[PDB]
Amino acid sequence: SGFRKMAFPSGKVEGCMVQVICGTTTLNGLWLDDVVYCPRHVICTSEDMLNPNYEDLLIRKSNHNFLVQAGNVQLRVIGHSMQNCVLKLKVDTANPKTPKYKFVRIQPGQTFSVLACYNGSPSGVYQCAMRPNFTIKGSFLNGSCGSVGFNIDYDCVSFCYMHHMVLPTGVHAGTDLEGNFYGPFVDRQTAQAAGTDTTITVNVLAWLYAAVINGDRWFLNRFTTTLNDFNLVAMKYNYEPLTQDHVDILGPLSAQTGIAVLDMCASLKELLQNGMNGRTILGSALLEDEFTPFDVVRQCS
Amino acid sequence: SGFRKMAFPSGKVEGCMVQVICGTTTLNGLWLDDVVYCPRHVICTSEDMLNPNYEDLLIRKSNHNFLVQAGNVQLRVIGHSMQNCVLKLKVDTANPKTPKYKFVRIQPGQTFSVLACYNGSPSGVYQCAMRPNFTIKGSFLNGSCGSVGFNIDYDCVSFCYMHHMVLPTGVHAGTDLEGNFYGPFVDRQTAQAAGTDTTITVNVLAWLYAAVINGDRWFLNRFTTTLNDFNLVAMKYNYEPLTQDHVDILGPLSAQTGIAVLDMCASLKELLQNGMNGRTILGSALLEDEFTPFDVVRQCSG
Numbered sequence: 286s287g288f289r290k291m292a293f294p295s296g297k298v299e300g301c302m303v304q305v306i307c308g309t310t311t312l313n314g315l316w317l318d319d320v321v322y323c324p325r326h327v328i329c330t331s332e333d334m335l336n337p338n339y340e341d342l343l344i345r346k347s348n349h350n351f352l353v354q355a356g357n358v359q360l361r362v363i364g365h366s367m368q369n370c371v372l373k374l375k376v377d378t379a380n381p382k383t384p385k386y387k388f389v390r391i392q393p394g395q396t397f398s399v400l401a402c403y404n405g406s407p408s409g410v411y412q413c414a415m416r417p418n419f420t421i422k423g424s425f426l427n428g429s430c431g432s433v434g435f436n437i438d439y440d441c442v443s444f445c446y447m448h449h450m451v452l453p454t455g456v457h458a459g460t461d462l463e464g465n466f467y468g469p470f471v472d473r474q475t476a477q478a479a480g481t482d483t484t485i486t487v488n489v490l491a492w493l494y495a496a497v498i499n500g501d502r503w504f505l506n507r508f509t510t511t512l513n514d515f516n517l518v519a520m521k522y523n524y525e526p527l528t529q530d531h532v533d534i535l536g537p538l539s540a541q542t543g544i545a546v547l548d549m550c551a552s553l554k555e556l557l558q559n560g561m562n563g564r565t566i567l568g569s570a571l572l573e574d575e576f577t578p579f580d581v582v583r584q585c586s
Numbered sequence: 587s588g589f590r591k592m593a594f595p596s597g598k599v600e601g602c603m604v605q606v607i608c609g610t611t612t613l614n615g616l617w618l619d620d621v622v623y624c625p626r627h628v629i630c631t632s633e634d635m636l637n638p639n640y641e642d643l644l645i646r647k648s649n650h651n652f653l654v655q656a657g658n659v660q661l662r663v664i665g666h667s668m669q670n671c672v673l674k675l676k677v678d679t680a681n682p683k684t685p686k687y688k689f690v691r692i693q694p695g696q697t698f699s700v701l702a703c704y705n706g707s708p709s710g711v712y713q714c715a716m717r718p719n720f721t722i723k724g725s726f727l728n729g730s731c732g733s734v735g736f737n738i739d740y741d742c743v744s745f746c747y748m749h750h751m752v753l754p755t756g757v758h759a760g761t762d763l764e765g766n767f768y769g770p771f772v773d774r775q776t777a778q779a780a781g782t783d784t785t786i787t788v789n790v791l792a793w794l795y796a797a798v799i800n801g802d803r804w805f806l807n808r809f810t811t812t813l814n815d816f817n818l819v820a821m822k823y824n825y826e827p828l829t830q831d832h833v834d835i836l837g838p839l840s841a842q843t844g845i846a847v848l849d850m851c852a853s854l855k856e857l858l859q860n861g862m863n864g865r866t867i868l869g870s871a872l873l874e875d876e877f878t879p880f881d882v883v884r885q886c887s888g
């Protein structure tokens with residue numbers, strides 16, 4: 286019953302958010318066990334933000350230059366290190382609400398939940414997908430740097446994203462929890478452009494299945510096609526190419542509906558070659574590509 | 587940058603969700619202080635859910651017939667009562683994770699965050715609006731009965747919704763935290779109709795202001811209008827009539843953008859009479875009506 290963009294409950298992540306100040310530079314940090322993870326951009330003064338020398342900026346810092354607080358509680362810093370673009374501050378207190386967790390690096394098209402924070406305080410929760418151009422379309426204001434994205438499986442939080450910066454097109458770029466950027470970006474206040482974005486084809490098909498699995502069925506037709514023929518149409522419309530693994534992943538959704546994957550690909554081809562007739566699918570007048578096949582089954586049980 | 591449907595952090599509410607069982611009938615409850623709140627429909631067996639006599643069913647229940655489980659902690663029921671459609675089970679242990687809270691009854695058009703739960707375990711969170719016909723368009727599966735909706739003011743949790751049932755339309759219907767249904771529905775398995783819905787005009791206008799704040803400006807045009815002339819068009823497209831209180835509410839968004847409210851109404855009238863011509867606003871190809879004026883301020887600033 287119903288189909289919505291749905292985020293994971295954020296309580297386990299809320300318990301891990303702290304404020305990190307270095308000089309006057311302020312951002313959010315992630316407190317797991319006795320380590321606080323935050324973007325290394327915190328060690329940059331306004332005059333270092335455009336072209337920072339992170340090796341030289343950090344060598345001149347000491348433990349007492351980093352102020353970390355979890356609400357009113359102060360955490361004394363007893364060590365600091367740099368791993369790629371992530372600063373690691375060892376503290377004297379282990380977080381008592383540290384959850385079961387793992388650091389993972391997600392693939393384009395995969396989804397996760399974002400907890401937007403400001404000055405170490407959670408502000409809102411929503412779901413994002415990693416775009417094929419390695420950006421995300423979130424909702425972030427000044428002070429959001431260091432907010433994290435995550436998935437939860439069986440009480441284990443998989444941290445996958447740390448927000449770093451906003452790009453000129455308004456999209457957002459960040460790293461994994463090991464400090465490695467998604468995409469070719471760098472941690473510097475320079476104008477950096479994302480590539481042309483493409484549509485996650487497997488996700489659009491999964492969303493089309495969810496519609497039938499709900500009720501919308503006007504887009505279904507009598508045709509079928511081949512993976513090769515569809516991918517020729519997919520390339521023209523800035524859609525990701527479909528692989529046999531994509532076809533295999535959509536198997537469960539294809540089983541419940543009795544609609545062959547290649548039958549749905551033919552339906553999608555027609556929607557692209559003509560239009561959506563100004564009619565709506567699952568309450569939207571556009572083709573939605575930020576629902577994974579897993580997102581669909583877990584909501585359409 | 588960007589504008590999305592954004593739910594409140596659910597941590598304070600997660601620590602209050604418990605499982606309630608009565609025989610084999612199972613649903614979710616809300617544990618605050620020494621009281622667990624849940625839909626009274628839990629005291630129905632399979633053969634009772636069609637036309638239950640709740641007073642007859644309750645009189646034959648005793649404390650030990652209610653199993654309340656908070657994760658792996660078992661709670662002990664030392665009393666029970668019925669308030670409207672909500673059953674209240676007093677337990678021997680006050681919830682340590684009880685936040686500063688409040689029970690409120692929202693108005694049609696107001697939004698809240700929903701924490702969907704199954705078997706007393708939280709499962710997901712999203713934003714909903716109370717439709718003008720007192721239904722909500724959410725995402726609920728079997729076993730979601732008892733999930734709650736809420737807003738957060740700094741540290742105070744304002745509970746405004748408890749989920750009861752899915753209607754024929756597929757829409758969802760529930761009560762406030764004193765057991766009173768939003769709308770004309772009853773807690774029984776019978777076909778119930780909700781009236782025709784209408785579009786929350788003041789919420790659409792607030793959404794249009796958010797687009798201006800985020801750099802989406804193509805719909806602003808050369809016209810102005812009057813409140814009375816706009817409602818002629820609004821009544822025509824199944825929109826709520828616009829009041830002076832709506833105009834006053836949109837005041838802050840008007841002043842921050844420099845666009846008069848009546849001017850934005852005229853741009854909305856044009857959008858209603860000509861469509862969008864394949865263009866999008868804030869990444870949507872429709873007029874969104876589930877963002878209140880307060881939602882826009884909370885997200886576009888602070």
Ligand SMILES: Cn1cnc(Cn2c(=O)nc(Nc3cc4cn(C)nc4cc3Cl)n(Cc3cc(F)c(F)cc3F)c2=O)n1
Pocket residue numbers: 309310311312324326327425426427428429430449450451457471472473474475587
């Ligand atoms: C509008 N918007 C959308 N997303 C963001 C995220 N974001 C951010 O929150 N902060 C940034 N710069 C800082 C300025 C500070 C001023 N004080 C006093 N303290 C500050 C701390 C930060 Cl991090 N930036 C810009 C930015 C941050 C980076 F980490 C980076 F590598 C390059 C950048 F250009 C920012 O984008 N804002």
Ligand SMILES: Cn1cnc(Cn2c(=O)nc(Nc3cc4cn(C)nc4cc3Cl)n(Cc3cc(F)c(F)cc3F)c2=O)n1
Pocket residue numbers: 286610611612613625627628635726727728729730731750751752758772773774775776
């Ligand atoms: C698809 N969907 C969307 N929303 C809902 C909510 N919902 C629900 O979760 N459960 C319901 N009936 C029960 C059956 C049970 C079987 N066992 C073993 N235990 C059960 C407990 C319940 Cl509550 N219903 C139906 C329903 C629930 C009510 F509270 C009510 F007053 C009338 C109703 F018809 C339900 O809608 N499911």
